[PDB]
Every structure is written in structure tokens, then in C-alpha cells.
Design a protein around this ligand. Structure first.
Ligand SMILES: Nc1ncnc2c1ncn2[C@@H]1O[C@H](COP(=O)(O)OP(=O)(O)OP(=O)(O)O)[C@@H](O)[C@H]1O
Ligand SMILES: Nc1ncnc2c1ncn2[C@@H]1O[C@H](COP(=O)(O)OP(=O)(O)OP(=O)(O)O)[C@@H](O)[C@H]1O
Ligand SMILES: Nc1ncnc2c1ncn2[C@@H]1O[C@H](COP(=O)(O)OP(=O)(O)OP(=O)(O)O)[C@@H](O)[C@H]1O
Ligand SMILES: Nc1ncnc2c1ncn2[C@@H]1O[C@H](COP(=O)(O)OP(=O)(O)OP(=O)(O)O)[C@@H](O)[C@H]1O
Ligand SMILES: Nc1ncnc2c1ncn2[C@@H]1O[C@H](COP(=O)(O)OP(=O)(O)OP(=O)(O)O)[C@@H](O)[C@H]1O
Ligand SMILES: [Mg+2]
Ligand SMILES: [Mg+2]
Ligand SMILES: [Mg+2]
Ligand SMILES: [Mg+2]
Ligand SMILES: [Mg+2]
Ligand SMILES: [Mg+2]
Ligand SMILES: [Mg+2]
Ligand SMILES: [Mg+2]
Ligand SMILES: [Mg+2]
Ligand SMILES: [Mg+2]
Lengths: 372, 372, 372, 372, 372
């Protein structure tokens, strides 16, 4: 079933949304809350359209309502970081992604962009590109996957992957709407496909340079939640939404530098993979908002997945931790794919770890403080 | 859960509202009734579009149907005070807020704008600015909060504040429609956010100078009721809609003068707070249409509220009666927030009390009969 | 009777699809999976609008999710073959039909276009024209024909063929939508009619030259499946959807050469039919994805059908395996109709067999390996 | 008589400008050449629309063709400083005002904005406002005022000031076009009027804060020249275009600070005028691109002008060098007017002199090198 | 001063061009005639819009009317090479640049693209980029520069370079129209500026890869001639249109390879310049349609030009044959500028010579024949 809000008359809402706006402009501020997984938002009115992110004012919120601050000193501060066009209200209104700071101006516990940005600036001449494949499952308000038989299961897997038809693909209206909204907003969405599990979907973001990878994915996540709210369904990024013989959800991360993209760049790809082979446990902890417990329910070495305990790598191997595409090996240049991150990973944490291990030559179980 | 009127075919209505109007103009007169909380309205046809509020004629209504008039002499009179564009019928139609007068031209019992306007004119050179935060709860026609489980409760508080998603925010269609309608009408709406309680919302009005603060909030209240009527739900301003461990509803009032907004204006902010500390009982009575009984169900000292019995003030203190924002204290200028008024307060009463205590230096338990 | 996805608010989706796209372009890649009858699809973003099919890049997919490869070396490759406008997303977005190749660049088992194209190039100067009549039945998600009484049957056949009215034709909305979408996309749709069975329909594609007949029919099949997904119903190409005294579903194929279309071309029509009479078993095997088992449930010699194991031909005979239209016989030129292929046939298999038997004079029960 | 270019078919040009642009954007770079009075421009293509001035790249030009560079090291560099919308090409095309730097990155001789900007940054908290009244004369290509009798004169002065009618105002089409173009571009144009001499006009720019005054006036001058080019006439800023009993052209500059604009600000107005009284020769030198020679032909003490030799100030005195408006004197606050600058002054030089005499308390005949 | 055709009523023509086209499409074929500098054009009707250049048919013309063939065997053939949108007729009509072949299918004498294309295919992995600055002078039909005084001269040079105003820039309507038409057609126009001589202008094309530089410049030349035909003026590419102390017209060519554009690419820039120093006479011959006689009237060592019979090179030297920009020298990467080609050069001849000398290491006075 769907939510009570989705049963309201949507034609009424569009009549009000058709009213000409006038001179004022709406800006929606978006930030990550104390769980490191959820998003929050609210709107303020501006006198004129902002042209760049630098001319948006700072804002604030009460951190005791988001489990981010204690009692006495509960005020937290929002600092705009990236701006996009608003697909839900249209031009000239904006979406604003913000960094969160405590009352004493130190970064919040779940503010991982502050450290990630400094790391990205250390290797800016190498031009790192990232590409992330975000998988998710559409859910009903009753906790069951959308379009599944009530208290039951659909047919066995096999016909749902990249499927077409009323009996093969569930919820394509959400997917189509999310795709168009991202393109309007300016998010670098690269494609979509239906997944092995019915009502499971995937969209790809990238290639993005540096810190902009995390900014684009978080805004894409927000747009998906807001679109699903209109239809009355829930999108979940849980790695294993359904137990048993049903496909899980991950966030594959593709990585490349300027050196790897040039001729005979496969040599630098092999060197990065060698460095990654020595830090398996460090990346497992960084690829999860809970230190790796979430990914354990998904990475068991079955259904085209790698083992949580073991590191493996190979060309055109979809059962390994790291996969080199057959085309990349054939042309001796390109990129490589990290298949370990879970679907609920923080992109800032994932991208920072890749830079530290591969480009800054860090060792040990702790990140090196200041420089590399 | 929703009204029978909201199940009518809204597409039929839109066809009729698409008919070109012609030369005549509709004007809707709005006034406050004998309970001091309710609004009333009716429509007349004008020959041409009025350019200013002074061009609108006086009107009348039967006061025995609104519990505002005695038996024999029942006629009451409407005097236009402020004009806005009508978002429900579009240009050139208008909304008109009116003052209510008795058959002998004395102001009605619930007509509090008449005295508030004269007080505002006494301090016009100090340029008082007001900002009010209106909280409300969306309810179904069955007396239960909209989108709540039937005869039950949702999950515990914590994820609903500034939330996004089908399972976190209830009734955002109403909020979006109300925001755009106010902008079209000319109401100075400053922003909105979702509140701690699911289906609870807040919108900010201001900063407004003098008597215009009361006019803008009352018209914003009317627009919200009329928008909710289209969707078939009820908006309530009751301070404590749900007993127990559920968030209440208030109307925080922000106040500043020309002296407070200049450099080193924090000195004048502290002076006003000192004067307010001596008149706690006077402001409690003025901040409620019932005299304080309504606010007693909300101001108990828990859920980030101050006690109804005690006066407290501090910088960045959200549990005190008066709060100075940290940024204001750091820059030594700005405004201060009064967190005592209830969500169903009359803005004309609230703003008049602040001017009398802080700018006219009044004492005692009664207002000064003539001027100050 | 209809899917859960079809009960979502479609007005919401159209609001998002009204957003201006911008500079990027969506391309949907379509291919045939390992069962030989099902279609698959996924979408990628391009930087600018492609003008010809040669400008589209190659792509890939995981073949272990489509039963087209197992174990290691499961990656498959997609090569664009034909391009059409996208009726579901409108200009400048595109639909792309692709050929499938395995990891070593050999054609896949169900890739029959690769051999069919080379055969058509060997007879290019004779300009073969094909026309195919695709029959299908609309079904509810419960496995029963759409609009049929629950656990029951409608009235006896006879009033449904080419019928009009609420009690005679079921599902015309799908038929009208499919017709317009095909015209927009560029598919050579020639007409439609209602069939003997209620909820059964037919559309004609052609006349198409050479390899383009297979491309046009497959894309028309995809468009039909995607349109039915919007309405929440299933379109089936099963030869005998309902057992007993109810009409079956076939795919009649009309064939002509340049010599056949000229004056006194009936001589070459009779020559081709004579050659077809000697290869009945070879064409039965090639007219079915199961080698003839599916067509056995349909071709029993009743309800205006030919016998599965007997070959017959005649002028104006609708019970024979090959029919010469009376107009063609009178004018001594034109085409002829093969009524044996089943509704779920692969068009590349059907067209290739006709060329081999009639134009290349092949004999035996195997196709000639090299040219001719 | 008018230019040959203006006799070309303008309808032909408008057909070409109706063609849709596409994705590329034109940017016109504008700078001041070696004479200190003339403007230069050229256009480049950009890949996408820039949102702020900081996104525009640096450019260069050959300084030996503009007489501000030597032979061997003639390359000069352009640094964008302010961006406006282009009224001649419309959105999304831009106008860019730039600063000029030598090959060794030192400012050019006529680059007066570099020093003026630093002076404005050390009085930023006082918020200086400027308003300038630019007078000009429209001239034919034959060197005679536009619309004047051939080899002769019109009637005596008196009916032309703020005149209407074919025999009173010459060239209102240029004035109307210039007013609209400035509003579209974002130039803060405040008004226009016809002047005492026929074919003489005036437009007012402001009030502008700090360094913005120079940028807005220079761009307004460029727009005027470009508009006159379309009509085939010449706009001249020469202080005395016609000898004898005909009105001259000035550039009255209005000045105020935050203290001047507050209650009892007349005290600070009188303070600044006292400081200006002892630096008359310094300001005459700075109010002219030739050190004062040009203004000598205009400021002779006749036709409502002050003498070039002596300093005078008074309330409501239009014959004095400094004039206090009567309303300002009555309300005891506001601004004051400097009537000395000639119509061909550089605004960066004029505004810099006012601030460092009235706000930084400089003395002597040379500017202070550091800070002040 | 202008053509008789330009005095016809252009409003009449625009009425006919407003008629809806229908289904047919116009295609204008363009080629270079026997003088090596002039262009010819011809229009045919097509049944449907062509999507790529490969689907346009071959055409022919009578070569004895263009002095390209002898008497008996005079038929020539046109082969499409590049396609652009038509700015004079708008979509869906096209411009088609063609190669010319003799009756025996051998390339014509002035067909230099055929050899240039094969040379560019030998170095395609080095990605050569070209950028050309085309200078031209606008002339009246009487043989005098447009807007110049009859039988006379304007003022001395110096105020016309990058000038604005009726007395400074002549013919900007043509320049603006040409700019917009090129953007619509798809020509990579990079910018424009006014030149030292009044009525002299320049537009830049590039950066273009490989053979596309010749196609883009030739089509830009055609568009300029056709635009000037509308206004009734002549555009000339003669190197020295006016004898004496008036600037000439050149076609400076900028060149870069992939190695030159990478870090420390200045090393490969110096190597190419070193090779160019040995082949001055060979490049002088190839930079002129008449072998060098035209460029002799321009390259005399005065007015910022190099000597015709002397080679020089330097950083930031505008008087040398080859100039290295100062920014390129400082960043140690980029491109370099060849200032020797005259304004009437053939771009295919110019680009081919640069590749042969710098990338293929050719020596001697003749090009290498055996495909190298
Ligand atoms: N050079 C590159 N550097 C970084 N990321 C890249 C690069 N090139 C492509 N990518 C990214 O790689 C991703 C490609 O993954 P995609 O989902 O298309 O295929 P796949 O990984 O083979 O599929 P599957 O879902 O079966 O694993 C995209 O997000 C794309 O943006
Ligand atoms: N100078 C001012 N004078 C008066 N009101 C002001 C002034 N500046 C801002 N305001 C008003 O103060 C209000 C700000 O309240 P807002 O809801 O944004 O934040 P808050 O009080 O921190 O939040 P919360 O709901 O958590 O208490 C607005 O209504 C705004 O118009
Ligand atoms: N010369 C030709 N060569 C090939 N196909 C042709 C030729 N002329 C027509 N056709 C095709 O023949 C088909 C005719 O199908 P149609 O549905 O009209 O047949 P019908 O005679 O009404 O038969 P039925 O009752 O079995 O449906 C069309 O698909 C048309 O494109
Ligand atoms: N507070 C202020 N500070 C600075 N400039 C100001 C201020 N207020 C107004 N101005 C400017 O003063 C100028 C007034 O010019 P205006 O031509 O209207 O004056 P005027 O009295 O008619 O003069 P005149 O008769 O000599 O033309 C405008 O450019 C306006 O922007
Ligand atoms: N890397 C490159 N390779 C080749 N051409 C390039 C490259 N970068 C820029 N160009 C081209 O160089 C040209 C620069 O011409 P431009 O008119 O700006 O030169 P300039 O320095 O102003 O010289 P001039 O004073 O002689 O006109 C453009 O046509 C541009 O496309
Ligand atoms: Mg993927
Ligand atoms: Mg992947
Ligand atoms: Mg608030
Ligand atoms: Mg508050
Ligand atoms: Mg048929
Ligand atoms: Mg048939
Ligand atoms: Mg004036
Ligand atoms: Mg003045
Ligand atoms: Mg140039
Ligand atoms: Mg030049």
C-alpha cells in the first residue's frame, strides 16, 4: 500500500503550482543528519535569484531535534557547498547542499566532506574521476517490496533484469521521473537499468572529478526520496532488503586518474590494485556507515558477490572485489571498479579512502593527520 | 479521513474557472468573529478593479449569526483595512481584510487592530519590526492527525523534524500550495519547515513593520484554511493537539527596533528584556485568547519549552522565555525572540503588548487608557 | 486484474516529464535475450543527439542475468543495428535495437540477424518485400483475458471481429496508443483490426525491404509491451492462449520480389509456391522458437486454419497453408501469403527461410553453410 | 547627415538576429584605451553561459594599435571586473568591463580602477553613495549638432529644456533606446531629461555604492555609443561643443555617507564641504583627463556655472561649485552636489578624490602613497 | 555605392520566406572553381531531410562555364564532403560542401582537399589542432572601401582598431549577421574584432581537428559572401586592398599537437619551429594561390609584418614570421602562430604544408609522393 498523502488530489496541487511566482525566490537547504544516512531539508525565501553558491547566506537549525547536539548548546550551522536547479519548483528556485558545523565552528561528527575536500585538493593535478552505481529497492508503506504479492513472493529471478512489461518491471514511473528531474537539476546522471530482483533498480552517476562526486550522489539521493514521496512509496538503500535467495544492493565505485586514462595506463591501474590488496580491512570499515556490519548481510560470496573476508582481483571477473573491464584490459587504458561498497555508503568516505590508499601511499589502520 | 467535498470531481471545477471573467471583479471580505480565533468571509461583485484599499466600499453583516451582536440591533459593519491579490481566483480579483464595528460605530469586542494601530503610530520613528513563526497541525475530519494510523500512533519522535520521504513527512502538498499562494497574494512569507511531530508544520512571516505584521499573519491564516479546505483536511492552531509525549504548537515572536539593528544595538536589546522580566503575568494574559489557560497545556517545561510560571532569559537558550540568538550576541546587534505566545494567539494583542512594555515603559496590570 | 504500478498517480509523472530536458539525450538500448522471444532494455546518457545509427557507441551487459552465458566470461556486447525516435520520451531521445555478441565476438545463440543480413545481401537486386500480420491477446495480471468475466467466458464468437462498442471490443485504448506511438517512432505500421476473439487484436507491418522487416517488427513488439506496461496489462503472443473453441494467434507473412510485382508476375509466384511445397517440414521448424511444438496447438485444421503436417495452396483459400489473393490472381501480379508462422515467431528466421527456399534454391533439411 | 552604415537595410539584420543561437554564448570585452576617454571592444565565443564575473577567462590585445604600449613588448592583458547582460544580442550573451595590465602585470597608465578600488575598501563601513549626471550632445557625421539647420543655428535657448514636440526636442529615439537598453543590461539608470541646448540630453546614474559607480557609468557610456552607432549619429562628451551663447556639458557628482543620510546628518555634510574648500586646485586637476584645460572652456561663471578659479558653496545655489539641495537643508540630512566635473571626466578618478579628501583627511597636492 | 539588388523591397521577400515549406527539403551544393579562390553554388530539391553527409547524392556541373575543363569532355562531378545547417533558409534545409572531380574521376586541379585528407589520416593519433584568423575588407560596388569618403580618405589609423561608434567602425551589421549565421550553421567561429583599417574586420575559426579546419573556413567564407550579397556590399580577401599607409590582410594560422598541449610541451613547439626555419621558400609558395606574388604586396616589413624573403621567430614577437604567445612560453605548453599566410590562402594547402614539415619530416622543394 501507499501513504495517505499520495491519495490527495494532485490536480489541486498543480493549480497552485501554476500561479506565477513573482520576484521572490525559494531556496531549499539540504544536509546530512546524525545517523550519517538520512537527509534533512527546509526552505527560506530570498529577495533575488542567486547566481553562484558563494552568495547564499549561512543558516542554522536546532541540533537536538536531529540527534546531533546536546542540550545547552544545541544550535548548529549550515554552510552552502553546492547549488542545483530545483526540479520540484522549477526555475528560478534552487536546491542547496550544505556542510554542518557545531556551535564552536568545528565540523559535525557526520560532516565527512570537510576532510575529503582537503584530500582532493592534494591530488588535483592527477584529476581523479569517480563513477558510482547506486542500487535501491522500492518499498510499500507496509514494509513489503512494491508490487509484490501480499504476504507472498513473485516468481523466481531471471526475467526481471533489464525487463519490460507489466509482469517484469515494477515502478518504472518513479525511475522515469527521477531521471528527468536529475537532468533538469544538473546532476550528472549517466544511465539506469532494472535489476535482478523485481522492484529493484539502479542509476549511475558520473564520471565526476574530485569532491563533486559526493555532492552529485547525495543530491541524487535526495531527489529520489522526494520523488518517491510524491508517489507514496519508500526507496531503501539497505544492502539486503529481503533475506534468502534474492539479490542484494551495492554501490560499485569506478576510479581513474589522468595517468590511467592515457595510453599504457593499465600499468598504473595494476599498481593501484596492488596497493588496495594490502588494506582490505581498512576499506571495509570505510565502506559502511556502521563499520562493515551492514555489508556482511550482502557480501557472502554468492549471487555474483565477493566474500567479506577475502580480497580478490581479476580482469572481467564479477565475483571479485576489484574488476578490470575486458575492454580496459584490451585497450591497455581506462579505469577499474571497486565492488565492495554497500548501497548505503557515504560517498565522501568512499572516495577519500581510494585517494589515500592509491595516490597518497598511506599505511596502517588510521588515516594520517594533515597532508598524507 | 477527508471531507465529502474533497471527493467531488476537481477537473469539472477547473473547466469553469478557465472561463474568461469579463469586466466585473470579485472581492472577498474577511473578518474575525466573536471567538477571536475564527475567520469569516463573503464575496461581492465590483464594477472595476480597485487599485488601492481606499477605493473599496464599506459593507455589513448580521452579527447574530456570528455571536457578535445583541438581539434588536444586530447589524455590524465592515471597514476595509488591507488588500491582497486573490490566489484562488487570480487577477484581477482581490482579498480584503476588514475591521469590525458595532451598529453605533464603536469597535467590536474582538476588534483589537483599532487600538494596536494607534499604539503603532506612537512609535513609528523607531521602526519596530516583527517576525512570527506559526506552527500548526494537519488533521483529518475524524479528529485524528492526518496520515496517522487509525486508532493508533506512528513511531517515536526524532526522524520527522525537517524530514523527507513517504514515512517521514505527511501532507507536504498542502505546505507547497500554501507557500506559492502566499507569494502570489503578496503575503511576506519567509520560509517553512517540518516539525518534530509528524503532520506538524511551521511557516514564518516577516520581517514586518508596525501594524502590517498582524494583517499579514491573519491573511496567511485564512489562506491556509482555504487551501486545506480544497484538500479536505483541517488545520488546527491548538497549542497541545495531542496529549502526552508529543510536540506542542506555539507562535514565537521576533522583535527589533531601529536602535537594536544598528551597531552595539545589543545594549538596547538587554534593556527591553529587563523591562519584560517585570511583566511576565501581563504578557501571559495577552498572549492567549483565553487568558493563559490554553498555553498552560503546552508550557510545562519539557519538550524544549519554558515553564508557564517562571520567566527566564539567556543567549542561545531554547528552554527560556526569551532567547537571544548566538549570532546576534556575537555581532552585538539584531533582534530577540519571545517564545511564550501560543499558536492560537491574536497577533494584534501580541505586538501591542511588546510596544507598550518595551517602548512606552508601561507598568501595572492594565494598559494605559490614553497613549502612554 | 491490473498491476499495482498502473494504480500510481499518472498525473504526477506527466509533471516531471514536462520539465525541459536540456542538452543531454537519452538512448534506450534494446536486444533479444536467451529465450529467443523476450526483450531487454536499459538506458544511457549521451552528450549530444545522434544523427545516424553509426554514431552510437557499443555497450555491454552481464549475460548471466539473461541466461545467455554462465560462469566466468559472462560479459556480452551490444552493437547498434537500427535507430528510431522514442515515443515515450519524445525528441531528441532515441530507441536503439542491437545485435548481441558473446565475449569472443561470435554471435550469440539467439542472434539470428547476423546470418539473415548476409543472406539478404546476396539477393539485393531482386528487392524482396515482406509484410507480417502480428496477432496478440491482451491479458490481465491474473492470467485471464482482459475484460472477460471473472472465472467465466463471454458470449460466443461472431460479433467481435472488427467490432465496435462497449460489449464488442476490449482494450481499444492500448491499440490506439500503440498505433500513434509506432507512427511517431518511424515504424512502418500499415493498419490494425479487432480479431474473432474478444480482447484479441492484430496490427500489420510493411511492406518492408530486406532486413528492415525484422527490425521494424521487433521494435513494434517492444513498443506494444511498453505501452501495455503503462496501462497495467500484459500482451501475449502465445499461439493458443485459450483452449477449446476460441481463436488462435498467428503471424501471416506476405512475400514478393521485383519480378513478382511486374506484369505477368503470377508466373514467378507459382514457381516459388512450387518450391515451398517440397520443404514443408523445414519451414515448420523455422517458424517456431521451439521447432514446431507451439504451432501444433494452433494448426489443427479448424477455425480457418491449415493442418500442421499437411501442405496445401490455392487461390483465395484461407484454409490452405499458402493463399494467393483473388485480386493478385486476377491482375496476374502481386504477392502471396504464408499462413503457417506462429504469433511468437522470430521474423529473422521466417524471412531467411523464404529467401533460401525461393530465391537460392536450397534443398535438404539443413541450411547451406556458405553463400547460396 | 548620418553615416553610410546606418543607410543599410536594418530589416535584413533583424532576420539574422532572429535565428536561434544554440548552446554557444557570446561575450563582449570592453576596456578604456590610452587616451583615457575612448572605449574599445571585441567578442569571443564561450562554451556555456557564465554565472558570475569570476568564471570569465583573461584575455589580451595588441597595445601598439591602441597607443598604450611600446613596440617590442606590445602585448597587454585584460582582466574582467564587472558583468552585465547584453542588450544588443540579448540573453544569454554578456558584456564584460575589464581592467588593463601591462606585459609585466603592472596596471596601465589609464587603468585608474586599480587604485580607486583599494581606496573604497578602506572606507567600506561608511558606505559611500555616488550619483552622477552625464550630459552629452548628439552630433551628425558632418561635425554639426544633429537636427540643427545646415550651416546655421536654431532659435534662441529657452524652449528646449525638458521640451516636447518636433520643433523642441531632437533625437528622442536614441534617448528612449538608451534608457531601455540600460534597464535590460542591469545598469542603475535613474532618469533622463532634455537640456537647455537642442540636441543636448542628460541621463542620471545611481545611487551606487563604492567602486560600482565607475563600472555603471562606463558601461552606460559604452551602451550610448553603441546605440548611437545603430542610428548613425555621434554622441560627444566634450564640455563645450559649440562656442558662444550655447549650454555646456557637465558631470555633476552627488555624494553621501551613512552618517550623512541619518538624522542631523547636515553636520557631516558641512564638515566635508569645509575640507573641499581648501583643495580646489587638487580637484580641478582630478576632474579632467587633461588636468583642467577642457573644463576651462566651460566653467567661466556664466550660463549657470561657477568660475574655474574660485571655490564657492551654498544651499540651493546652482551658480556655486558645491550645492546643498533645499530639501536636504530643511530635513537636516541627505547628500550634496559637486558641480565642477566636466562631462568627459573619468568616474574612477572623480570618486577617488572625493573619498580621500572628505573621509581620509588628505592634504597637499599629491595623493598619499600607502593606506590613506 | 551598393548593388541594385539591395534596393529591392526586402519586406516582400520575407513574406514569401514565411510560407511553410512542406515535406520537401532544399540542399545547396558549394564548391571551389578553377581560380582556386572563388566559390560556386547550386540548389536541388530532396524528398526528405538528410541526417548525415553520406546519404546525399552525387551531382555534376558543366566545367566549361567555370574554366575547369576543356571543350568535348567538359562534365565535372560533385562529391559531398561536409554538411551544415542553412542559415539563409533555416531548418531542415542544408549547405553541402563538395569535392570536384574530372570526367575520368581524377581530382580537379584546384581540388586540394583530396591529398590533404590522406595526409591528415597519417598523423591522426597526434590530433593536430588548427586555428585561423581570417581578415577581410568590406567594399562598395564602386571599388572603394565601404563608408570611406568619395574619392578620398578617412582620418589616420589608430582609433579604428577594436573601435566603437559611428565615426570609428563601418559595417558592423554585416559582422553581427555573419557571426549569428555561422553559429546557427554549426561553424566553429571563435570571435571577431575590428581591425586597424576602417571597414576592415577579422573573424577567428577554431580550434579545429584535422581536415575539418579547411571545411569550416571555406563554409565561413561562403556565408560571409552570401550575407554581404544581402546588404549589397563586397567582401574582399586581397592581401593589400589599399596601397600605401594602410594595413593589409593576413590569415594567421595557429598550430598544436597533443604532445604540444601537455605539460612541458614547449619542447615540441621549439622542435617544430626549428624544422620550419629550413623550409621558408616552400611555405611561401604554399601560402598563396599564385605562388607568393600576392603576399609580396603585404609582407614588406612595415606595419607589424615580417619580411617576405626572411625567416624569424621569437616569443611575444609580432614582427616575426612565427610568434610564440607569452602565456604559452610561461606555462611551457600550448601552441604557436604562423603569421606568413595571406588572407586569400587555401586552408587545405596551408594545413597540409604544416603537417608535412613538422610531423612527417619532409625535405626538398617538392612534396613526397609515395604516401608519406
Ligand atoms: N574513466 C572513468 N573513470 C571513472 N568512472 C568511469 C569512467 N568511465 C566510466 N565510468 C563510470 O563507470 C560506470 C559504469 O558502470 P555501469 O553500471 O555502466 O556498468 P557495469 O559496471 O559493467 O555494470 P554492472 O551493474 O553489471 O556492474 C558509470 O558510473 C560511469 O560513469
Ligand atoms: N531584525 C528582525 N526583526 C524581527 N524579526 C526578525 C528579524 N530578523 C529576522 N526576523 C524573523 O525571525 C524569524 C526567524 O525564525 P526561524 O524560524 O527562521 O528560526 P528560529 O527561531 O531559530 O527557529 P525555531 O523554529 O527552531 O525556533 C523569521 O520569522 C524572521 O522573519
Ligand atoms: N507486394 C507486397 N509484398 C509484400 N507484402 C505486401 C505486399 N503488398 C502488401 N503486403 C502486406 O500484406 C499485408 C496484408 O495484410 P492484411 O491484414 O491486409 O491481410 P488480409 O488479406 O486482410 O488477411 P487476414 O484476414 O488474414 O488478416 C500487409 O502487412 C501489407 O504490408
Ligand atoms: N543619498 C544620495 N547619495 C548620492 N547620490 C544621490 C543620493 N540621492 C540621490 N542621489 C543622486 O543625485 C542625482 C540627482 O540628479 P538630478 O538630475 O535629479 O538633480 P537636479 O537637482 O535636477 O540637478 P540639475 O538641475 O543640475 O540637473 C541622481 O543621480 C541621484 O541618483
Ligand atoms: N591549442 C590551440 N591549437 C590551435 N589553435 C589554437 C589553440 N588555442 C587557440 N587556438 C586558436 O588561436 C586563434 C587565436 O586568434 P586571436 O585572434 O585570438 O589571436 P591574437 O593573439 O589576438 O592575435 P592577433 O593580434 O594577431 O589577432 C583562434 O583562432 C583559436 O581558435
Ligand atoms: Mg552497473
Ligand atoms: Mg558495476
Ligand atoms: Mg522557526
Ligand atoms: Mg523560533
Ligand atoms: Mg490481417
Ligand atoms: Mg493474412
Ligand atoms: Mg540633473
Ligand atoms: Mg545637478
Ligand atoms: Mg586575431
Ligand atoms: Mg589581427
Amino acid at each position: 500500500t501507499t501513504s495517505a498523502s499520495s491519495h490527495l488530489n494532485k490536480g489541486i496541487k498543480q493549480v497552485y503550482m501554476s500561479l506565477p511566482q513573482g520576484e521572490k525566490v525559494q531556496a531549499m537547504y539540504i544536509w546530512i543528519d546524525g545517523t550519517g544516512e538520512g537527509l534533512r531539508c527546509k526552505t527560506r525565501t530570498l529577495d533575488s535569484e542567486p547566481k553562484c553558491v558563494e552568495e547564499l547566506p549561512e543558516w542554522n537549525f536546532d541540533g537536538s531535534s536531529t540527534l546531533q547536539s546536546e542540550g545547552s548548546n544545541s544550535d548548529m550551522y549550515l554552510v552552502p557547498a553546492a547549488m542545483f536547479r530545483d526540479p520540484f519548483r522549477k526555475d528560478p528556485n534552487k536546491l542547496v547542499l550544505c556542510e554542518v558545523f557545531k556551535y564552536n565552528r568545528r565540523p559535525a561528527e557526520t560532516n565527512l566532506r570537510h576532510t575529503c575536500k582537503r584530500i582532493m585538493d592534494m591530488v588535483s593535478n592527477q584529476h581523479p574521476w569517480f563513477g558510482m552505481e547506486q542500487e535501491y529497492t522500492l518499498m510499500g508503506t507496509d514494509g513489503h517490496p512494491f508490487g509484490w504479492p501480499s504476504n507472498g513472493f513473485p516468481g523466481p529471478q531471471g526475467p526481471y533484469y533489464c525487463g519490460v512489461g507489466a509482469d517484469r518491471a515494477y515502478g518504472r514511473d518513479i525511475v522515469e521521473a527521477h531521471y528527468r528531474a536529475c537532468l533538469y537539476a544538473g546532476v550528472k546522471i549517466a544511465g539506469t537499468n532494472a535489476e535482478v530482483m523485481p522492484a529493484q533498480w539502479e542509476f549511475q552517476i558520473g564520471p565526476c572529478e574530485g569532491i563533486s562526486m559526493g555532492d552529485h550522489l547525495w543530491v541524487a539521493r535526495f531527489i529520489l526520496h522526494r520523488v518517491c514521496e510524491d508517489f507514496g512509496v519508500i526507496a531503501t538503500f539497505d544492502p539486503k532488503p529481503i533475506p534468502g535467495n534474492w539479490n542484494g544492493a551495492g554501490c560499485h565505485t569506478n576510479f581513474s586518474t589522468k595517468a590511467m586514462r592515457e595510453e599504457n595506463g593499465l600499468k598504473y591501474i595494476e599498481e593501484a590494485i596492488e596497493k588496495l590488496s594490502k588494506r582490505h580491512q581498512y576499506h571495509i570499515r570505510a565502506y559502511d556507515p556502521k563499520g562493515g556490519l551492514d555489508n556482511a548481510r550482502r557480501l557472502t560470496g554468492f549471487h555474483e558477490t565477493s566474500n567479506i573476508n577475502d580480497f580478490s582481483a581479476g580482469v572481467a571477473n564479477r565475483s571479485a572485489s576489484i574488476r578490470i573491464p575486458r575492454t580496459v584490459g584490451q585497450e591497455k587504458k581506462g579505469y577499474f571498479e571497486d565492488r565492495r561498497p554497500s548501497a548505503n555508503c557515504d560517498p565522501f568516505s568512499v572516495t577519500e579512502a581510494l585517494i589515500r590508499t592509491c595516490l597518497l601511499n598511506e599505511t596502517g589502520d588510521e588515516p594520517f593527520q594533515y597532508k598524507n
